[PDB]
């Protein structure tokens, strides 16, 4: 299953549309959790950013500890304990600004081996750039970078086609040029 864990500090009114467009572009059912925060880990005071690798490990631990949330009713509890990362993929939508060791920042990150991914609207929001709110733009961006990260969870790498969801954006302008679209090469792999 695919679970959108929407940190409620991100405007929860955007939750449902993001969930529905993620589901359409992935062509897969996506369940929405948007009634709670996910306190982040691995904060770096000099950077003023959070280590996304640590958050992702914490996310796996949370899933394993929370059968009552993520385990399908028809799934044995012991099977879930061993295999939750194969079956219940999670995308965390967090307000925190993210980095990884090799990068000044990231819009998101995936840990394919543990079936967990993360996207941060912190640099996707118009407001980060001193521009007025634009809910549709923010939905567009989260969907595109969210489907990207989730694609990784299914084994896809970065794509060369700049309009494809799997393309890796260097900046916000490149991200906005991506379309809600998996190219031919990527759809075959994703299937
Ligand atoms: Fe592609
Ligand atoms: Zn990527």
CSV table of C-alpha atoms and ligand atoms in Angstrom, one decimal:
chain,number,residue,atom,x,y,z
A,1,UNK,CA,0.0,0.0,0.0
A,2,UNK,CA,1.0,3.6,-0.3
A,3,UNK,CA,0.5,6.0,2.7
A,4,UNK,CA,0.8,9.8,2.5
A,5,UNK,CA,1.8,10.8,6.0
A,6,UNK,CA,0.9,14.5,5.9
A,7,UNK,CA,2.4,16.5,8.8
A,8,UNK,CA,-0.6,18.7,9.8
A,9,UNK,CA,1.7,21.8,10.2
A,10,UNK,CA,1.6,21.8,6.4
A,11,UNK,CA,-1.8,23.4,5.4
A,12,UNK,CA,-4.1,20.3,5.7
A,13,UNK,CA,-6.5,21.7,3.1
A,14,UNK,CA,-3.9,20.7,0.5
A,15,UNK,CA,-3.8,17.1,1.9
A,16,UNK,CA,-6.7,15.6,-0.1
A,17,UNK,CA,-5.9,17.0,-3.5
A,18,UNK,CA,-2.2,16.0,-3.1
A,19,UNK,CA,-3.4,12.5,-2.1
A,20,UNK,CA,-5.7,12.3,-5.1
A,21,UNK,CA,-3.3,13.5,-7.8
A,22,UNK,CA,-0.5,11.3,-6.4
A,23,UNK,CA,-2.9,8.4,-6.8
A,24,UNK,CA,-3.8,9.4,-10.4
A,25,UNK,CA,-0.2,9.9,-11.6
A,26,UNK,CA,1.1,6.7,-9.9
A,27,UNK,CA,-2.1,4.9,-11.0
A,28,UNK,CA,-2.2,3.4,-7.5
A,29,UNK,CA,-4.4,3.8,-4.4
A,30,UNK,CA,-2.9,6.2,-1.8
A,31,UNK,CA,-4.1,6.4,1.7
A,32,UNK,CA,-4.0,9.8,3.5
A,33,UNK,CA,-2.9,10.5,7.1
A,34,UNK,CA,-3.1,14.2,8.0
A,35,UNK,CA,-4.1,14.4,11.6
A,36,UNK,CA,-0.7,14.6,13.4
A,37,UNK,CA,2.8,15.9,13.3
A,38,UNK,CA,6.0,13.9,12.7
A,39,UNK,CA,8.6,15.5,15.0
A,40,UNK,CA,11.8,15.5,13.0
A,41,UNK,CA,15.2,14.2,14.0
A,42,UNK,CA,18.8,15.1,13.1
A,43,UNK,CA,18.5,18.8,13.3
A,44,UNK,CA,21.7,20.7,12.5
A,45,UNK,CA,21.9,24.1,14.3
A,46,UNK,CA,24.7,25.7,12.1
A,47,UNK,CA,22.8,24.6,8.9
A,48,UNK,CA,19.4,25.3,10.4
A,49,UNK,CA,18.2,22.2,8.5
A,50,UNK,CA,17.2,18.5,9.2
A,51,UNK,CA,19.2,15.4,8.2
A,52,UNK,CA,16.6,13.6,6.0
A,53,UNK,CA,18.5,10.3,6.3
A,54,UNK,CA,17.8,10.3,10.0
A,55,UNK,CA,14.2,11.2,9.6
A,56,UNK,CA,13.8,8.4,7.1
A,57,UNK,CA,15.2,5.8,9.5
A,58,UNK,CA,12.9,7.2,12.2
A,59,UNK,CA,10.0,6.8,9.8
A,60,UNK,CA,10.7,3.1,9.3
A,61,UNK,CA,10.9,2.7,13.1
A,62,UNK,CA,7.5,4.5,13.5
A,63,UNK,CA,5.8,2.3,10.9
A,64,UNK,CA,7.1,-0.9,12.5
A,65,UNK,CA,5.9,0.3,15.9
A,66,UNK,CA,2.5,1.2,14.5
A,67,UNK,CA,0.6,-1.8,13.1
A,68,UNK,CA,-2.7,-0.3,14.2
A,69,UNK,CA,-2.0,2.4,11.6
A,70,UNK,CA,-0.3,0.8,8.6
A,71,UNK,CA,-0.9,-2.9,8.7
A,72,UNK,CA,-3.8,-4.1,6.4
A,73,UNK,CA,-6.5,-6.0,8.3
A,74,UNK,CA,-5.8,-9.2,6.3
A,75,UNK,CA,-2.1,-9.1,7.2
A,76,UNK,CA,-0.6,-11.3,9.9
A,77,UNK,CA,1.2,-9.2,12.6
A,78,UNK,CA,4.4,-11.3,12.6
A,79,UNK,CA,4.5,-11.0,8.8
A,80,UNK,CA,4.1,-7.2,9.2
A,81,UNK,CA,6.9,-6.9,11.7
A,82,UNK,CA,9.3,-8.6,9.3
A,83,UNK,CA,8.1,-7.2,6.0
A,84,UNK,CA,6.4,-3.8,6.6
A,85,UNK,CA,9.0,-2.0,4.6
A,86,UNK,CA,8.3,-4.1,1.5
A,87,UNK,CA,4.5,-3.6,1.6
A,88,UNK,CA,3.5,-0.3,3.3
A,89,UNK,CA,5.4,2.5,1.5
A,90,UNK,CA,5.3,5.8,3.3
A,91,UNK,CA,5.7,9.3,1.9
A,92,UNK,CA,6.2,11.9,4.7
A,93,UNK,CA,5.2,15.5,3.9
A,94,UNK,CA,7.1,17.6,6.4
A,95,UNK,CA,7.5,21.4,7.0
A,96,UNK,CA,11.2,21.1,7.9
A,97,UNK,CA,14.0,22.2,5.5
A,98,UNK,CA,15.9,19.1,4.5
A,99,UNK,CA,19.5,18.3,3.6
A,100,UNK,CA,21.7,15.2,3.0
A,101,UNK,CA,25.4,15.0,3.6
A,102,UNK,CA,26.3,15.7,-0.1
A,103,UNK,CA,23.8,18.5,-0.6
A,104,UNK,CA,23.1,22.1,0.5
A,105,UNK,CA,19.4,21.1,0.6
A,106,UNK,CA,16.9,18.7,-1.0
A,107,UNK,CA,13.2,19.0,-1.8
A,108,UNK,CA,12.9,15.4,-0.9
A,109,UNK,CA,14.7,12.0,-0.5
A,110,UNK,CA,13.9,8.3,-0.6
A,111,UNK,CA,15.3,5.2,1.2
A,112,UNK,CA,14.2,2.5,-1.3
A,113,UNK,CA,15.5,-0.4,0.9
A,114,UNK,CA,13.1,0.6,3.8
A,115,UNK,CA,10.2,1.8,1.6
A,116,UNK,CA,10.2,5.3,3.1
A,117,UNK,CA,10.4,8.6,1.4
A,118,UNK,CA,10.0,12.3,2.4
A,119,UNK,CA,9.1,15.6,0.7
A,120,UNK,CA,9.4,19.1,2.2
A,121,UNK,CA,7.2,21.9,1.0
A,122,UNK,CA,9.6,24.4,2.7
A,123,UNK,CA,11.2,25.4,-0.6
A,124,UNK,CA,8.2,24.5,-2.7
A,125,UNK,CA,5.9,27.1,-1.2
A,126,UNK,CA,5.8,30.5,-3.0
A,127,UNK,CA,6.3,32.2,0.4
A,128,UNK,CA,9.8,30.9,0.7
A,129,UNK,CA,10.6,33.3,-2.1
A,130,UNK,CA,8.7,36.2,-0.6
A,131,UNK,CA,5.8,35.6,-3.0
A,132,UNK,CA,2.1,35.4,-2.1
A,133,UNK,CA,0.5,32.0,-1.4
A,134,UNK,CA,-0.6,29.9,-4.3
A,135,UNK,CA,-2.3,26.7,-3.2
A,136,UNK,CA,-2.5,25.2,-6.7
A,137,UNK,CA,1.2,25.8,-7.4
A,138,UNK,CA,2.1,24.1,-4.1
A,139,UNK,CA,-0.1,21.1,-4.8
A,140,UNK,CA,1.5,20.8,-8.2
A,141,UNK,CA,5.0,20.9,-6.7
A,142,UNK,CA,4.4,18.4,-3.9
A,143,UNK,CA,2.7,16.0,-6.2
A,144,UNK,CA,5.5,16.1,-8.7
A,145,UNK,CA,8.3,15.7,-6.1
A,146,UNK,CA,6.3,13.3,-4.1
A,147,UNK,CA,5.6,11.0,-7.0
A,148,UNK,CA,9.3,11.2,-7.8
A,149,UNK,CA,10.4,10.0,-4.4
A,150,UNK,CA,7.8,7.3,-4.4
A,151,UNK,CA,8.9,6.2,-7.8
A,152,UNK,CA,12.4,5.5,-6.2
A,153,UNK,CA,10.7,3.3,-3.6
A,154,UNK,CA,9.6,1.1,-6.6
A,155,UNK,CA,13.1,0.9,-8.0
A,156,UNK,CA,13.1,3.7,-10.6
A,157,UNK,CA,16.2,5.8,-11.0
A,158,UNK,CA,16.6,9.3,-12.4
A,159,UNK,CA,15.2,9.9,-15.8
A,160,UNK,CA,16.7,12.1,-18.6
A,161,UNK,CA,13.4,13.4,-19.8
A,162,UNK,CA,13.0,16.8,-18.1
A,163,UNK,CA,9.2,16.6,-18.4
A,164,UNK,CA,9.1,13.2,-16.6
A,165,UNK,CA,8.3,12.9,-12.9
A,166,UNK,CA,11.6,10.9,-12.5
A,167,UNK,CA,13.8,13.8,-13.7
A,168,UNK,CA,15.9,15.2,-10.9
A,169,UNK,CA,15.3,19.0,-10.6
A,170,UNK,CA,18.3,21.2,-9.9
A,171,UNK,CA,16.1,24.1,-8.8
A,172,UNK,CA,12.4,25.2,-8.5
A,173,UNK,CA,12.2,26.4,-12.1
A,174,UNK,CA,13.2,22.9,-13.4
A,175,UNK,CA,10.7,21.3,-11.0
A,176,UNK,CA,7.9,23.5,-12.3
A,177,UNK,CA,8.8,22.4,-15.9
A,178,UNK,CA,8.3,18.8,-14.9
A,179,UNK,CA,4.8,17.5,-15.9
A,180,UNK,CA,2.4,15.2,-14.0
A,181,UNK,CA,3.7,12.5,-16.3
A,182,UNK,CA,5.8,9.3,-16.2
A,183,UNK,CA,7.4,8.9,-19.6
A,184,UNK,CA,7.2,5.6,-21.6
A,185,UNK,CA,10.4,4.1,-20.2
A,186,UNK,CA,9.4,4.9,-16.6
A,187,UNK,CA,5.8,3.6,-16.9
A,188,UNK,CA,7.0,0.2,-18.1
A,189,UNK,CA,9.5,-0.1,-15.1
A,190,UNK,CA,6.9,1.1,-12.7
A,191,UNK,CA,4.6,-1.7,-13.9
B,1,LIG,FE1,10.9,9.0,-17.3
B,2,LIG,ZN1,15.6,11.4,-6.9
